[PDB]
């Protein structure tokens, strides 16, 4: 009775970057769906082919959470509609994703005096991309002739560039935190039900 780890995803005091892609396979939860519906005013609560009103009466076997920080201009593309840099290189959803995508403004707590580090984004890795598969490989990308053999530098500056977030009440495309939720149903009993 009343045992759920949902509040371990929200309010983490440190959100993983898009390269980290902090998953959390959550099971055995029979309460605490109020932390999802009632919270700070959500910038986006775009759910998908699982009815958000009907979850309190439907039990799930696996509840997968995913958290990351992205720019407010890139609050889209968290959907089966693969489009954009973050979609084609960083993070992507399947065709029949059955879950909810929650996003909210994080400009109030991720404000930095200097910024331009601690968060990264990908430029070009089109040769490798799979849904629910993080590509944390960051050695080098192919350009010119030689991959600079890991001692890269001038004339082989092809590797990725990190985010330049430094909001000091001086940005409009503020950084937003996102908590993606997904569900699965297999040939196994469902353990994540609603409160009784």
């Amino acid at each position, epitope marked *: 009775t009343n045992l759920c780890p949902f509040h371990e995803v929200f309010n983490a005091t440190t959100f993983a970057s898009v390269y980290a892609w902090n998953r959390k396979r959550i099971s055995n939860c029979v309460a605490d769906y109020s932390v999802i519906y009632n919270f700070a005013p959500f910038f986006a609560f775009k759910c998908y082919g699982v009815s958000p009103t009907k979850l309190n009466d439907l039990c799930f076997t696996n509840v997968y959470a995913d958290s990351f920080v992205i720019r407010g201009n890139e609050v889209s593309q968290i959907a089966p*509609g693969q489009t954009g840099n973050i979609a084609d290189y960083n993070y992507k959803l399947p065709d029949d994703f059955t879950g909810c995508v929650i996003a909210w403004n994080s400009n109030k707590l991720d404000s930095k005096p200097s910024g331009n580090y601690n968060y990264l984004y990908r430029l070009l890795r089109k040769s490798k991309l799979k849904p629910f598969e993080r590509d944390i490989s960051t050695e080098i990308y192919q350009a010119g002739n030689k991959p600079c053999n890991g001692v890269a530098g001038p004339n082989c500056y092809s590797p990725l560039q990190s985010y330049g977030f430094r909001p000091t009440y001086g940005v409009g495309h503020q950084p937003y935190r996102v908590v993606v939720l997904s569900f699965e149903l297999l040939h196994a009993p469902a353990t994540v039900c609603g409160p009784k």
Partner: antibody
Amino acid sequence: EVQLAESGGGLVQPGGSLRLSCAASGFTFSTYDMHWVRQVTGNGLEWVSTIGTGGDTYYSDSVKGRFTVSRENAKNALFLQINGLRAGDTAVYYCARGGSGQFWYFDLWGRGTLVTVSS
Amino acid sequence: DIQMTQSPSSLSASLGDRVTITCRASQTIGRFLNWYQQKPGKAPKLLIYGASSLQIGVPSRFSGSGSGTDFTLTISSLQPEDFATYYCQQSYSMPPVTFGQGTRLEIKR
């Protein structure tokens, strides 16, 4: 018969508040979800908002921020509260009931309360 | 954000004509598409839910079916009570449930 009513129709000043209601008949109002879908005069349908059985509220992109749906299981009446209307909101807010299933579908539409926003 | 671009509304036909109302979306919505029939003298009403399931009180000629991204609210034979506007709706995205622009069924002469 099983029909959805409506109220709150009438002329209103731009920016003034307004409340619409949606009475129930026959069916159980407390075990079915309710939705609001407005239709601009001569245009097509446009989804506005909805509140589920568990009291959870949902709104649209051009609706969230100033509208506030309200459900009271007593009197079997759905409610919708509006704040700060404008000219682009002149539409008939058809009340709708959500049927049982895994996806949202509207199986009972009300008569439709008309809202004309102008000074 | 998910678009629901429908076929051109200018689709005239007489009685009995096999009208085929086609409506597509921006991506796969599964079987969550559903139609709505609105005569411009009364309230809206649904025709097909789940894109394949006939509504109670709707005859068998309303054979609206489809799969994945393509749907056709086909009426093999019309009736004087069928001339109205028809709207498609997707339920894949639950909170932003979007509609189409519509299609008007008019009597041909």
